[model samples]
Target: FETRFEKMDNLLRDPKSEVNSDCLLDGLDALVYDLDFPALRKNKNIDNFLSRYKDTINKIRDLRMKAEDYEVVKVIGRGAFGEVQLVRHKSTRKVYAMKLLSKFEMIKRSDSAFFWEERDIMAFANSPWVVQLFYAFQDDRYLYMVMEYMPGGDLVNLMSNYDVPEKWARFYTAEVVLALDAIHSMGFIHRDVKPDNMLLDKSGHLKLADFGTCMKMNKEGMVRCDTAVGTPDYISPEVLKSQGGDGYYGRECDWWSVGVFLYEMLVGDTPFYADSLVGTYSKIMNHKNSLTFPDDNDISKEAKNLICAFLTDREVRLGRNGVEEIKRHLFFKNDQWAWETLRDTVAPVVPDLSSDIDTSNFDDLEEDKGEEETFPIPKAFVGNQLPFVGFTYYSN
Candidate 1:
């Protein structure tokens, strides 16, 4: 329903121009095309309305983004199904990370590939903690998700190159708390929260990324799913238990991931790390006994307390009451972190870029030249219309 009137809504609420009769007529035309109600088709008032506002019905259309607008510079990352390329807008010269997903791959992995939700989350999140989406469009072959370029790379890379201090850890953990709160307020759960999904913007502030596994919860603020989504190391205990397909979990699951992230920041590795995937799950299931911190580093007790509070039972988790609970922790208090002006605060490490299109922070990825796979479309979609209708978007 939202997609059907996307353009009409944009036109109506566009603050760039005053609402005019032409805008109303265009909105009415859009409503008729999509809804096509019986009375509207046969009512004589339709002709009268058109005749009344005839001259005001000036033709105007919003310009949509296309693949040709971006010039691909290099492949920054690659996944099983797609590649993320560093692109520059031809006209504006603004740098962006253009994620290209093959249509055939999307259709084949319909159950796993969450293209729609990923787009929706990035488009509507409207938070500094979330990455900004400039444009999202599709072609017969691929779907392009053009987002703000984060030259500071991801958290995993930062941890590998340099030792993360306790101060930096507090700042980033607080940012993650804010990010999770924003997502929860929007009625969605970021099921896949991990180091890989936490991206650093150019100024080194954290922006949560990768909403492919995110899901909208019911009115009860819980999502019921059987599949164990997210990285094994960061997966919450309740989420693993839900694999039995009889239980449900809520925003507390994200706080558990925050615990893992904070541990990784101060310590070099996750608390529940094990040799094998099965062993990892086992350790997570028995986190009460398995979770521990190494004694080599002079880690503060306050930090440990915060992590412990988050990595506990969901009923008593730190973030169950939202960011307010986490902010009240001693760790944040010790760091003197300011929550209201978090964006205005200085970042620990800003990217030293030689140019706007620099790709130094990101590791070079080889393009996948393998043969592409195809899937047969269902009979329900037999016309020129594709399954991804109304997927196109413009930020403005």
Candidate 2:
């Protein structure tokens, strides 16, 4: 048992460990039952245990219940937001991705706006390609959001496995274009839309996830989001302008993100990059209308031309053509081929899903057996160095 626990610990700690998908799944399966049944059952004298071990057991149960409420069966991915666990419904056994957010950390950072925005945007969005939000609930120190699980994982992982074919890129780009249009039409702006936000379901359909930076548009169809947000490489020129005169652009910025997405799909990197954020910001603010394709890149001129058009000035950008025009672009001329190829296309193929995912990895994880620390810690406010109250509308 100790050896098994050690093996599981090693795998969880090292991202590059050779514990294949099956090993992880099997390990979790064993741990879940072990922690819930025998180990917990061994604590005889429920009443006395509650008296003596009550605090620790409750803490452990709370953590376990938190994991169960989120239906997390296995840890699939991790990010700055928190660990994304692949969970199964307690009753239905249906799989979903549970994103765990530490409320204490969020409050400490004074990121309430982002917290509210992400949950609201996800709950409001109902697109097939957008990750579905099953529910959002909070606890004393954490918030849990249950989202549709994507077995295919993120686009970044996909790209790492196989080079994105041009036709597939076009197809994927078209879907994202429609997603952006849907988000904008619904009175919201998905401020962030990089590859990491795009996920693939088991059937190979794309699902957009991660709404931490999204915002709702105001009545005038304008959103004056001042924070310099979005992944640096994908940020639009308007955001890069250091001088505040640049008007607050809304939906149009999403199109620029699309353009960046398309560029990376074909070229494998951002067009503009520098050693520092300031340098990158300068390059974006002073960007030219024309795009220069690298000699080594094999993409066609038509694709490059389309990219240039989309990344051009806000007025003349891809918005003019609407969805159809984007679909009709030479890049997407082979839509049929793109769909057949990209859909359900798994790269770096692993063992079959049924055989690959075993749930035994979690068997020995000692249930968290400690009391939750108090909330609203006195020094929490001090950590938020940014002034949240004073800044009103500074225009652009």
Q: What are the lDDT figures for the candidates, one per model?
A: 0.76, 0.61
Using TM-score as the measure, the top candidate is 1
Instruction: Report the backbone clash tally of model 2.
Output: 22
What lDDT does candidate 1 reach at residue 254?
89
Clashing pairs counted in every model: 0, 22
Q: What is the TM-score of each candidate against the true structure?
A: 0.81, 0.68
- What is the alpha-carbon lDDT of model 1 when measured against the actual structure? 0.76
Per-residue C-alpha lDDT of model 1 across residues 35-143, encoded as one tens digit per residue: 3334443556654565554444233222345677888899988765689899989999878888887766656655534666677788888899998777776545677
* Worst ten in a row by lDDT for model 1: 376-385
Q: How close is candidate 2 to the true structure, as a TM-score?
A: 0.68
Report clash pairs, candidate 1.
Answer: none
Candidate 2 has an lDDT of 0.61
